Amino acid sequence: ERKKELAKEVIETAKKLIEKLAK
Amino acid sequence: EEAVRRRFEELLREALAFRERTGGRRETLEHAVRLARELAEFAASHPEFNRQEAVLLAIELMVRAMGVTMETHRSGNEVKVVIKGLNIDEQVALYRAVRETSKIMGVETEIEVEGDTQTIVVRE
Amino acid sequence: SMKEEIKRLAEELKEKTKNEEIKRLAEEAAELAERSDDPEVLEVVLKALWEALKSKNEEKIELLLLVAVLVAEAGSVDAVEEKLEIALLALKLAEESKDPRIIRGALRAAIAALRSDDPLALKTVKEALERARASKDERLIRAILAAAYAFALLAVAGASAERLKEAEAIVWYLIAAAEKGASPQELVLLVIEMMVKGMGVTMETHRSGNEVKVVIKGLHESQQEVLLEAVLFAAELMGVRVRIRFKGDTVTIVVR
Numbered sequence: 001e002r003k004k005e006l007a008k009e010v011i012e013t014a015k016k017l018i019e020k021l022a023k
Numbered sequence: 024e025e026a027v028r029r030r031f032e033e034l035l036r037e038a039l040a041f042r043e044r045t046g047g048r049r050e051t052l053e054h055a056v057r058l059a060r061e062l063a064e065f066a067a068s069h070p071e072f073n074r075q076e077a078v079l080l081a082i083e084l085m086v087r088a089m090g091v092t093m094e095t096h097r098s099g100n101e102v103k104v105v106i107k108g109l110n111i112d113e114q115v116a117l118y119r120a121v122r123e124t125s126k127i128m129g130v131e132t133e134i135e136v137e138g139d140t141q142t143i144v145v146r147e
Numbered sequence: 148s149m150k151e152e153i154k155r156l157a158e159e160l161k162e163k164t165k166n167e168e169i170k171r172l173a174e175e176a177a178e179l180a181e182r183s184d185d186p187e188v189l190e191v192v193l194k195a196l197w198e199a200l201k202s203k204n205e206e207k208i209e210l211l212l213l214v215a216v217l218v219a220e221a222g223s224v225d226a227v228e229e230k231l232e233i234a235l236l237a238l239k240l241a242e243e244s245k246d247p248r249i250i251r252g253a254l255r256a257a258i259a260a261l262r263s264d265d266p267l268a269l270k271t272v273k274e275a276l277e278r279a280r281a282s283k284d285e286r287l288i289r290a291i292l293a294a295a296y297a298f299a300l301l302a303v304a305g306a307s308a309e310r311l312k313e314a315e316a317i318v319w320y321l322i323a324a325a326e327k328g329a330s331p332q333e334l335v336l337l338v339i340e341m342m343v344k345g346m347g348v349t350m351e352t353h354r355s356g357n358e359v360k361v362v363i364k365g366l367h368e369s370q371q372e373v374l375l376e377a378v379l380f381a382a383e384l385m386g387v388r389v390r391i392r393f394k395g396d397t398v399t400i401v402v403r
Contacts (some may be wrong), residue, residue: 001283006231010186013238014218015194020242021210021250031200045162049174060332090167110168111379115372118393122368138383 027072028063030081034058038088052112055088056120063124072131075102078145081124082106082117091114101146109139115143149189153180156196161205164206172212173199177217188222191215205248213254214238220261229269230261237277246285251386252292253279259299268302271295271315278322286385290325290334294318297338297377301345304373316344331385332402336361338381340402342374360401371398 038058048054059081066077071109072100079095082104091113095104106117114136121143123131135142161170173196176373180192194306195215199208221234233237236351237257241250260272280287298318299348302311321337329337336352339361343350348370366374378400381391390401 001302002227006235010218010221010231010234010238011191011241011316013235015213017214017238017242017258018195018198018211021207021214021215022202022229024215038171045158047168049161052171089388090165111376113167115375118375119368122393134393136183136379136393138388 024069024072027066027069027077031062034084035087036060038084042088042090048056049061052089052116055085056089056116056123059085059124060127064129067128073102074128074144077128077147078121078125078130078132079104082121082143082145085120087116089117101141101144102146105140105142109141113133114139114141149186150181153189153192154235155195156193156200160196160200160208163200164205164208166209169205169208169212172209172216176212176215176219179216179223179232179245182224183219183222184224185222188218189269192216210241210250210254213251213258215242217254217261218256220258222276223261227264229266229273231261232268233257233273235368236273240280244285244288244380246267246289248384248386249285249288249292249400252296252380255380256275256292256296256299259296259303263299263302263305264307265302265311267297267308267311267315268299271298271311271318275318284325285320285391286331287325289384289386290329290331292321293334293381294321294341295326296303296340296380296384298345300373300377301342302344304369307347310345310347314341317341317344331387333357335378335381335385335389339378340376342377346370346373357403358371359402360399361402362397364397366396366398371396374398 049090050092062081062084066072070073083093086106091108093104093106118134129145132142156179160173175253176192192215195211202208212284217234221231234257240253242255256272273296275291279291298314301314324337325334336359343363348365350363392399
């Protein structure tokens with residue numbers, strides 16, 4: 001439930017940090 | 024003695040062929056410590072081979088499997104080998120290996136870790 | 148398969164960079180991706196790997212692979228909520244700071260934390276990451292992360308839950324000390340004192356001549372490795388140069 005919320009929060013933030021480290 | 028040195032090259036062509044080949048377990052930094060232990064276990068079987076030579080050969084057998092540098096300056100009955108260019112996981116593997124080999128060889132050695140350099144003082 | 152691409156790009160990256168750190172992390176990230184059947188985690192690993200092949204800063208390949216290992220340990224099957232919480236704090240904190248030492252420190256601390264299923268340990272690093280998320284004092288942030296990573300190394304070692312209970316107070320003192328403006332030299336000493344107390348061994352720290360000299364006897368072999376990892380990472384993170392000399396299970400450290 002909230003684990004599904006934090007599931008998205010970790011996956012989205014990870015992909016945002018990847019793009020920030022790429023540029 | 025003449026057989027102790029032959030075993031070193033068999034393990035040196037094992038450490039180089041393992042660090043070179045892609046694939047396998049890239050966590051076989053323990054395999055390097057295994058080769059260093061196999062060399063000193065063999066050297067202990069020949070109690071006429073120089074202990075200091077056995078530890079130096081194991082430290083060299085280690086730095087080849089890791090891919091780092093090694094310089095040895097000799098003073099009295101002690102040799103000082105300095106290894107440079109180590110990360111934290113390599114500082115631990117090289118330390119654990121020198122700690123194993125000098126223990127299974129029954130010879131006094133002292134280590135000094137600082138950042139990316141690890142200085143070893145192998146004394147007779 | 149989605150894991151088949153991860154193995155190909157990971158093995159294709161080890162034949163490129165000649166930093167052993169890139170080799171162990173890219174291989175470790177691929178190995179964790181085979182357990183995780185979550186397609187969203189396999190996408191973050193595949194995106195980080197494909198983006199790390201193109202980049203050639205190497206230190207950026209480190210930080211990119213660190214996110215791949217962290218998001219993979221969280222994607223591990225049946226992951227507790229608190230684990231995912233710890234990771235989000237580290238991922239956010241890494242995005243909210245420009246120092247590459249903070250980005251590495253925050254990611255590595257959460258990676259080592261999720262290794263142990265110790266609930267007292269997961270809360271110590273979680274509350275620590277929250278505090279660093281608020282303050283902007285870089286030295287305070289680095290000290291909080293250096294203490295969280297060292298505490299995680301004790302938990303991964305598997306010390307007594309009572310020993311970790313004592314170590315928690317040393318982390319609380321460490322974070323408080325950096326709050327009161329402690330020097331970078333003394334903060335590292337607090338990291339060392341958490342290791343000796345968390346492993347059930349004794350110490351004998353000396354001090355004379357603007358150079359603290361902590362000698363520690365009784366440490367076994369495996370304990371000297373866990374000490375060496377935490378003290379070295381904290382020394383590089385805080386930015387101080389230390390010397391860890393070994394001689395018959397009597398570790399001696401020289402800070403300055």
